[PDB]
């Protein structure tokens, strides 16, 4: 009864119950996901309902213990995570209104239908075909149509709903001593009073705007190259001092330039590394690939699979007609019962996805000792970060020719290396300007700096200034372009895909500087080492029990994200791009327009 006893003795009970219930819920869910029937939806909805009701009751009960009389750090962190009101601080009818606006937004996004002006009877959804038209077509007219349509029919309906959504979320967040909603998102990177490891909510914006400054020397050259290359497929449509038209990037919103590899390959007659026929000519099943992944993981010094994962998991899609959503996922039903749900085919891409998923499996195996409320990554970003380095280290030619899938006399050269590096940088450094731009735009519109009659003009001037792309058609203020992105119209945070891109290469360099590697970083492997495994595992097992700025400094040695490893990873590509642009004009002028000529 030391004013904290109720804190520790409450916490226990909670712990137990929580864990148990959660498990019930989760088994239920895995079920429905692997065997789609009509009754299983009911078997899982009530389990989720009971879990949610129990958690909200415990949250309403935890309030009775003040948060300044606690002295131990871990119990204070657990209470601070549980004591969160979340929603339901609003007026009751406004809560239902918020649920309706959210669900209506999600539905209007999901079931969008756009139809041709030449044939309005049968037409296209978003997922089947629209992405294919925007990715694989090659005529300017069809791309411009597919681009303007989706923003003229799904951008116009969403604005009068997003307007109310903003103010409702702001009034929600403003009851928990917060000043807007964006701060309620940045609050994930917050650390209070640990004598030096503190990280104020504000300094996240400072880091982001301070690390985006060092990327531009590389992104500018990449933009110049991609532009001078796109000036071949569509002759006399781009200006050599202008920006790019949004409907030429490779998808609906311009998030990944990966589909531009067909037009901008450096050496179009030297094929890259690809183990796809060598696999099937060796009769590899879904079992063999996972055995290879586990062998690689155990080679570095991590434990085996739990021997309950080989009988329960579903590695190959069920033969008969058994509807199960084929989207890879790593389940941690808790209680040490880990599973992997994915419809593996015999392709090297699935061979890399297996590694990327067993990464999450290992990361979940590590921290299974912490209290139940601390079973996550250090923040939202570390999870996929620690996941992706396995795929980045398993795709190098060394690890391939050491497993029996490449001819021993396969000799790699600098041409194939530049090819691979551009294929990588079309995805890694390509999405960063878009990500930072969209997140800054959302923070701005939430804090109230941008008046609600200047949304689209500000968004497009930002697309002109930062990322270097220009709209093809004018858009007045009956539109809303950002509401046409999945992570926006569904109330999903969108800054993790910018911190992950940095944490990735920081982890890569920090780790395989212990494997005593000597060459460029893009050939670096973490196999056969034991110091690397220990350095990684001394962070994998913390969970949330320590501030993330300590989880970093125990791996790389710094107390923040630093972009230098990224540039050090791309240095060869940068040396090449500095030569292939001796005659073009780097950068872009925000005056050019595709219609004002």
């Amino acid at each position: 009864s030391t004013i904290e006893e109720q804190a520790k003795t409450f916490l226990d009970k909670f712990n137990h119950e929580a864990e148990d219930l959660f498990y019930q819920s989760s088994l239920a869910s895995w079920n429905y996901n692997t065997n789609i029937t009509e009754e299983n939806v009911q078997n899982m909805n009530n389990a989720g309902d009971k879990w949610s009701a129990f958690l909200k009751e415990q949250s309403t009960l935890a309030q009775m213990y003040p948060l300044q009389e606690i002295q131990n750090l871990t119990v204070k962190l657990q209470l601070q995570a549980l004591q969160q009101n979340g929603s339901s601080v609003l007026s009751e009818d406004k809560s239902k209104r918020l649920n309706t606006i959210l669900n209506t937004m999600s539905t209007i996004y999901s079931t969008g239908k756009v139809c041709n002006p030449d044939n309005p009877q049968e037409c296209l959804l978003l997922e089947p075909g629209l992405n294919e038209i925007m990715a694989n077509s090659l005529d300017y007219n069809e791309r411009l149509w597919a681009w303007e349509s989706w923003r003229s029919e799904v951008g116009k309906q969403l604005r009068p709903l997003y307007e109310e959504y903003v103010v409702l979320k702001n009034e929600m967040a403003r009851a928990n001593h917060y000043e807007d909603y964006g701060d309620y998102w940045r609050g994930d990177y917050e650390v209070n009073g640990v004598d030096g490891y503190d990280y104020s909510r504000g300094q996240l914006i400072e880091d982001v705007e301070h690390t985006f400054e060092e990327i531009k020397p590389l992104y500018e050259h990449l933009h110049a190259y991609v532009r001078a290359k796109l000036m071949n497929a569509y002759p006399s449509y781009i200006s050599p001092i202008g920006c790019l038209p949004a409907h030429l990037l490779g998808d609906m919103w311009g998030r990944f330039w990966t589909n531009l590899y067909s037009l901008t390959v450096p050496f179009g007659q030297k094929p890259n590394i690809d183990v796809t026929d060598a696999m099937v000519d060796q009769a590899w099943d879904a079992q063999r690939i996972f055995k290879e992944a586990e062998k690689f993981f155990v080679s570095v010094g991590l434990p085996n699979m739990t021997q309950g994962f080989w009988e329960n998991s579903m590695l190959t899609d069920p033969g008969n007609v058994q509807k199960a959503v084929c989207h890879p996922t790593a389940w941690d039903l808790g209680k040490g019962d880990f599973r992997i749900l994915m419809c593996t085919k015999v392709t090297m891409d699935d061979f890399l996805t297996a590694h990327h998923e067993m990464g999450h499996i290992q990361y979940d195996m590590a921290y299974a000792a912490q209290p139940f409320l601390l079973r996550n990554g250090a923040n939202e970003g570390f999870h996929e970060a620690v996941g992706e380095i396995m795929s980045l280290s398993a795709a190098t030619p060394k690890h391939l020719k050491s497993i029996g899938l490449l001819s021993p006399d396969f000799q790699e050269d600098n041409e194939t290396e530049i090819n691979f590096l551009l294929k990588q940088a079309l995805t890694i450094v390509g999405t960063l300007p878009f990500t930072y731009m969209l997140e800054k735009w959302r923070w701005m519109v939430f804090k109230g700096e941008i008046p609600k009659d200047q949304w689209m003009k500000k968004w497009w001037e930002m697309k002109r200034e930062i990322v270097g792309v220009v709209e093809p058609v004018p858009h007045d203020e009956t539109y809303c372009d950002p509401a046409s992105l999945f992570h926006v119209s569904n109330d999903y945070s969108f800054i993790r895909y910018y911190t992950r891109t940095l944490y990735q290469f920081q982890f890569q360099e920090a780790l395989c500087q212990a494997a005593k590697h000597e060459g460029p970083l893009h050939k670096c492997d973490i196999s056969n080492s034991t110091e690397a495994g220990q350095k990684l595992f001394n962070m994998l097992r913390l969970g949330k029990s320590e501030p993330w700025t300590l989880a970093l400094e125990n791996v790389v040695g710094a107390k923040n994200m630093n972009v230098r490893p990224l540039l050090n990873y791309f240095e060869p590509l940068f040396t090449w791009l500095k030569d292939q642009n001796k005659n073009s004009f780097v950068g872009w002028s925000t005056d050019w327009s595709p219609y004002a000529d």
């Binding site: 006893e5 226990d12 309950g308 040490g336």
Partner: protein, 146 residues
């Protein structure tokens, strides 16, 4: 003396002289001068029934830790706060018994293990029962050491 019960997987490390934890603290306490013999094995296929088998309980609230070889079976509602409970669950008045919910799809360290312990003690008796002897055919007509 022969004791037997069932406990979780990763808690068998607590049936040993001089340990601590939610199980060994106050469910079963072995002394510091133990002379017995601990046996413990896995019984997943015999005691775990899908959907939850809520028969086995384990106390996790008590005033103070136990005494060696002592036994406590009460069901008095705990009291952590300062206000007396009057036997009603709720705020700072917790039920003292929970249940292991075993299922066959658990990992090692959570499947039910069965534990038995032997303990000897020689009060004053000089003959309560000796161990097992050897075997062989007694030869005859030979000078032998018998």
């Amino acid at each position: 003396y022969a004791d037997s019960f069932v406990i979780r997987g990763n808690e068998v490390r607590q049936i040993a002289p001089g340990q601590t934890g939610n199980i060994a603290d106050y469910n079963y306490k072995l002394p510091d001068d133990f002379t017995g013999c601990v046996i413990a094995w896995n019984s997943n296929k015999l005691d775990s029934k899908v959907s939850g088998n809520y028969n086995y309980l384990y106390r996790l609230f008590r005033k103070s830790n136990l005494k060696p070889f002592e036994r406590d079976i009460s069901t008095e509602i705990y009291q952590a706060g300062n206000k007396p409970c009057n036997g009603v669950a709720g705020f700072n008045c917790y039920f003292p018994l929970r249940s292991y919910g075993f299922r066959p799809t658990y990992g090692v360290g959570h499947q039910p293990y069965r534990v038995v312990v032997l303990s000897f003690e020689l009060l004053h008796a000089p003959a309560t029962v000796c161990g097992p002897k050897k075997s062989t055919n007694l030869v005859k007509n030979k000078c032998v050491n018998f």
